[PDB]
């Protein structure tokens, strides 16, 4: 999961 | 109901990963609200004709700091609004919103801090939760560290959300860990120990004030989300949560009928009492946020888009849905946040944008  | 009236851009390009309206504005006064990005904080006031007045920030001496997040308060004595800041740094900053001098900080964590909240009855207790894994209570009174909630069954990983129910008497946190955990407030011990905090004067002691270690929640689940929990709200006794898998989920411990006071720490059950679904907001680090009411519930997507729930229906899985959007505006939404009077709702975005929506 990327946070951007 | 809502119309995009203004919107701007802050100077430094980076995300805004928060937004508060001040609540505790003095009637007669205009709406203020925060924006924390960067490595500063920044009041704008809300006037007619969608004018969003840029008023003054307070800018972090170490140009290395990123702001997560931002909570207001007022000082007990006073009634004087205080805004609490933090973010990377795990530093928690008091700021005085009219001079934006910062009154005074709290280190701990020392890790980054993700989100803070204040008790919604006692505007000294303040809890940051972190990267550390740990969630704490400070009374920003006597500025004292009343508890650390932590331990091998606390969070495994980073804590992202933490909300207090209604009268403040329990806690629901969740986390990169995929759980969320309840955490009471109310008990003997609890009570006691805020009870001490406010006696505890350094001058008049000779001891340091011993914090609470709290290492077992008094629920915990799993079973809500698939992926990292990054938004938690009560409503009632029921639960709103939400991941970065396009849903908020409508939840509570235990079977359809069981008391939340009642929920033992070994309760293996939820109910899942609806879910709200939406597009395009995979990211993690996405909060939505409710109204003073709690009638309505407001969440921004990866590009942009606002997505409005109703609540003022019968059973959560009733709610209806409207959805907002602007053709220049197409950055994510990291937060939103209602005027107290519910007139203006402002979302905040990674390109460093504003978003003024009027009703």
């Given at each position: 999961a990327r946070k951007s | 109901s809502f119309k995009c009236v203004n919107s701007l851009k802050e100077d430094?390009?980076?995300?805004?990963?928060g937004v508060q309206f001040n609540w505790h504005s003095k009637e007669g006064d205009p709406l203020v609200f925060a924006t924390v990005g960067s490595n500063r904080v920044t009041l704008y006031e809300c006037h007619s004709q969608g004018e969003i007045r840029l008023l003054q920030s307070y800018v972090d001496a170490d140009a290395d700091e990123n702001f997560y997040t931002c909570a207001w308060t007022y000082?007990?004595?006073?009634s004087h609004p205080l805004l609490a800041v933090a973010g990377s740094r795990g530093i928690i900053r008091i700021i005085?919103?009219?001079?934006?001098?910062?009154?005074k900080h709290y280190v701990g964590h020392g890790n980054a801090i993700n989100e803070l909240k204040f008790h919604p009855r006692d505007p000294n207790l303040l809890l940051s939760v972190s990267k550390d894994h740990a969630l704490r209570l400070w009374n920003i009174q006597t500025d004292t560290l009343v508890a650390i909630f932590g331990?091998?069954?606390?969070?495994?990983?980073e804590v992202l959300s933490a909300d207090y129910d209604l009268l403040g008497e329990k806690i629901m946190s969740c986390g990169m860990d995929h759980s969320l955990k309840l955490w009471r407030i109310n008990s003997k011990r609890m009570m006691n120990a805020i009870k001490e905090s406010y006696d505890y004067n350094p001058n008049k002691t000779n001891r340091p004030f011993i914090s609470q270690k709290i290492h077992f929640p008094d629920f915990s689940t799993r079973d809500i989300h698939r992926n990292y929990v990054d938004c938690v709200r009560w409503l009632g006794d029921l639960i709103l949560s939400k991941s970065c898998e396009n849903a908020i989920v409508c939840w509570k411990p235990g079977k359809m009928e069981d008391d939340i006071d009642k929920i033992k720490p070994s309760e293996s059950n939820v109910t899942i009492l609806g879910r709200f679904d939406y597009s395009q907001?995979?990211?993690?680090?996405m909060r939505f946020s409710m109204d003073f009411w709690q009638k309505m519930l407001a969440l921004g997507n990866q590009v942009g888009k606002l997505y409005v729930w109703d609540?003022?229906?019968?059973?959560?899985?009733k709610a209806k849905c409207t959805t907002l959007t602007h053709h220049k505006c197409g950055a994510a939404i990291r937060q939103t946040s209602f005027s107290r009077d519910s007139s203006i709702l402002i979302a905040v975005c990674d390109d460093a944008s504003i978003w003024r929506w009027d009703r």
């Open positions: - | 430094h390009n980076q995300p805004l990963f000082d007990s004595n006073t005085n919103p009219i001079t934006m001098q910062c009154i331990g091998v069954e606390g969070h495994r990983d907001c995979d990211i993690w680090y609540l003022e229906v019968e059973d959560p899985h």
